[PDB]
Amino acid sequence: NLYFQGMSLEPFGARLSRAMDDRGPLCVGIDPHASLLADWGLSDDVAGLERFSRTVVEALGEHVAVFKPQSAFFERFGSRGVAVLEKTVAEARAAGALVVMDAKRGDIGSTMAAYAEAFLRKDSPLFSDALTVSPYLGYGSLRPAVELARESGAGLFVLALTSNPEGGEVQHAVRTDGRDVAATMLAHLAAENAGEEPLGSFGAVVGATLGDLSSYDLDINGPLLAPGIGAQGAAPADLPGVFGAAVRNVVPNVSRGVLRHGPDVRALRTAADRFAEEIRAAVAA
Amino acid sequence: NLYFQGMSLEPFGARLSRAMDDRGPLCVGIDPHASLLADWGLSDDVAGLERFSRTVVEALGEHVAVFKPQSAFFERFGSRGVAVLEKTVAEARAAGALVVMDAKRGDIGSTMAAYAEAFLRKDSPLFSDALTVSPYLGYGSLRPAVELARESGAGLFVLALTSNPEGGEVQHAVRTDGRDVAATMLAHLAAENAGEEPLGSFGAVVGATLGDLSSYDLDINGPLLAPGIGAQGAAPADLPGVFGAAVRNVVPNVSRGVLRHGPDVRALRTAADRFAEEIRAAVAA
């Protein structure tokens, strides 16, 4: 029955389902943009970035199911920012939080493989439990990342439906079979996850503040990363009405609703516990 | 008539047009993937990455109009890989080559602004003359990067038409006005560049090996970054037939056709000069 360092991580969908049951249904962004740093009374530089990130994981790493660092806010400081990102992700995972790397990568062939190498293989200094990816180059172009994710017990979140003003421009465009781009991505994901229990590893990004989700089949047997929690119409109590039966597969992501309470570690904890409990209760009802 | 460190770079479209006239119409990829590193007899690690990148810029930095580092091949080594990327881009620009950062970024709002902060503002350790961006979230979502690029004298290349097997899945999907996604992006770019002389700063990625380019209006008054040069049907002599009148605005990107000749610096130079001359001659004819 031996241990070995090469043992595989259990599949992401299963690990995520367990984490949300155990710690509550919540993902907290790690979003050290200049606004939030100034709000925490920190400087807009690498030292500020680092203090913010460290405090978020110290306060919340043992308490939240999932974190979602946004790569751009680290990359703006170059390699030194990426070094803070490496440490942050390592510390978060060591505390038992899942990490969804929000980097929205998307490329072709060995270039796609190289992004997967960066984020989805265990030897990488940016190894994360899942990666957000953009499918502009087509679902099949993601194949190297899908395959490596399956091998590592990691997952993906493919951009599907976003709530920015322009998100419909591409997402609503219609293919020859009559499905739009978003519906096409959701169908690919449903096929990717077919038969995986209790939940597949290949999810979609679906904005919680959208009003037309009822026009999409969100039954993809994979997680739905839902940014915008706390915004008008996307309070915890609204989620069951927004997502229907699929709400059980939602990974609700809160950014400001938790982060604005830093740098006070008790205030951060209290806000995160409250969101997770309110979402748990809404979904249970 | 004074110098000042704050002086603005001349607009990217104008600088690019001049660079291709002066040094020849060629962009050379900086693509340190494991295959090429092994081919150069280098190890698949940060030290190998660094030796490859240094040799490419030493051999070619004074001789080629444009370089295109592919971020993924650096990111796979984490922060230490990004640090090599920083130095490579700095050395390339110091040698007078333009640098197109191929990072295919795409996000929303202040997150998009943060990617622009990383790559398109002069104080950033990754400052590049242009950035490749993915428009899955809609052309308008790129606005923070467009605005910052204009301010810095930098440009963008928006993914439009790619030659991977799946590229049509999204790119050919049709909007309510009858234009497909690619055509919509090209039209946005034409509007972005309207009236800019001799060439606008906002370009498209358009694969040179595609067979249906005649169905698109590539007259966008901006540069067309064309990967695949050297591939079947995308030899230098084929480019005028592939791109029509718009061939004068093509930034032809060669990767293996030049890079396979390393680490020999005379062989790298000879290959780059030959591609640039053959393309110059084809376009002139």
d(CA A157, CA A171): 15
Identify the H or E element spanning B281.
helix B265-284
Residue A237 DSSP SS3 = helix
Instruction: Give φ, ψ of A95 to 5 degrees.
Output: -80, -5
Looking at the complex, report in whole angstroms how far the Cα of residue B105 sits from the nearest Cα belonging to chain A.
7
d(CA A221, CA A197): 8
Residue of B33, B79, B134 lying closest to A106 (CB–CB): B134
Residue of A nearest to B45 (CA): A124
d(CA B253, CA B66): 9
Which residues, listed in sequence order, are joined to residue B66 by a DSSP beta bridge? B27, B98
Q: How many CB atoms lie within 10 A of CB A214?
A: 11
C-alpha closest to that of A111 among B47, B83, B259, B164: B164
With an 8 Å Cβ cutoff, are B136 and A106 in contact?
yes
Looking at the complex, report in whole angstroms how far the Cα of residue B1 sits from the nearest Cα belonging to chain A.
34
- CATH number, span B11-285: 3.20.20.70
Which residue type does B173 have?
A
Number of A–B residue contacts, CB under 8 Å: 191
- Name the H helices within chain A: 12-23, 34-39, 46-60, 71-75, 78-94, 109-120, 143-152, 168-171, 181-192, 239-243, 256-259, 265-284
Three-state SS across B209-252? CCCCHHHCCCCCCCCEEECCCCCCCCCHHHHHHHHHHHHHHEEE
Which residue type does B35 have?
S
B208 Cβ contact partners less than 8 Å away, ≥ 6 residues apart: B163, B226, B227, B228, B229, B231, B233, B234, B238, B239, B242, B243, B250, B252
B93 Cβ contact partners less than 8 Å away, ≥ 6 residues apart: B99, B127, B129
Q: Contact at 8 Å (CB) between B88 and B81?
A: no
d(CA B50, CA B61): 15
d(CA B150, CA B201): 8
Q: Contact at 8 Å (CB) between B115 and A72?
A: yes
Looking at the complex, report in whole angstroms how far the Cα of residue A22 sits from the nearest Cα belonging to chain B.
31
With an 8 Å Cβ cutoff, are A140 and B104 in contact?
no
C-alpha closest to that of A118 among A108, A107, A127: A127
Residue A174 DSSP SS3 = strand
Residue B266 token pair: 């005379």
The structural domains of chain A, with segments of one domain joined by +, span 11-285
Q: Which chain A residues are within 8 Å of B85, Cβ to Cβ?
A: 79
Distances (CA, A) of A111 to A24, A145, A172, B35, B211: 36, 10, 27, 12, 23
Q: What size, in residues, is chain B?
A: 285
d(CA A23, CA B207): 47
A45 Cβ contact partners less than 8 Å away, ≥ 6 residues apart: A77
Residue A249 DSSP SS3 = helix
Q: Contact at 8 Å (CB) between A181 and A171?
A: yes
d(CA A131, CA A223): 12
Question: Which of A136, A157, A210 best tests the B interface by mutation, with the highest count of B CBs <10 A?
Answer: A136
Which residues, listed in sequence order, are joined to residue A132 by a DSSP beta bridge? A157
Residue A48 DSSP SS3 = helix
| C-alpha Rg value of chain B to the nearest Å | 18
DSSP B89-132: HHHHHHTT-EEEEEEEE---HHHHHHHHHHHHSTTSTT--SEEE
Residue of A78, A115, A136 lying closest to B135 (CB–CB): A136
Technique that determined the structure: X-ray
Instruction: Give φ, ψ of B32 to 5 degrees.
Output: -80, 60
Q: Contact at 8 Å (CB) between A83 and A116?
A: no
Q: Contact at 8 Å (CB) between B128 and B120?
A: yes
* Residue listed under structure tokens 């090429």: B36
Q: Contact at 8 Å (CB) between A157 and A205?
A: yes
Upper half-sphere CA count for residue A163 (Cβ side, 13 Å):
18
With an 8 Å Cβ cutoff, are B79 and A125 in contact?
yes
d(CA A137, CA B5): 40
Residue of B124, B159, B174 lying closest to A174 (CB–CB): B174
With an 8 Å Cβ cutoff, are A138 and B76 in contact?
no
Residue A6 token pair: 């090469």
Q: Contact at 8 Å (CB) between A188 and B166?
A: no
DSSP state of B164: S
d(CA B161, CA B205): 6
Upper half-sphere CA count for residue A276 (Cβ side, 13 Å):
22
DSSP state of B7: P
C-alpha closest to that of B280 among B256, B250, B244: B250
Q: Contact at 8 Å (CB) between A226 and A252?
A: yes
Using alpha carbons only, give the angle B89, B147, B215 rounded to the nearest 5 degrees: 85
Instruction: Give φ, ψ of B126 to 5 degrees.
Output: -110, 20
d(CA A204, CA A71): 18
Using alpha carbons only, give the angle B87, B66, B138 rounded to the nearest 5 degrees: 90
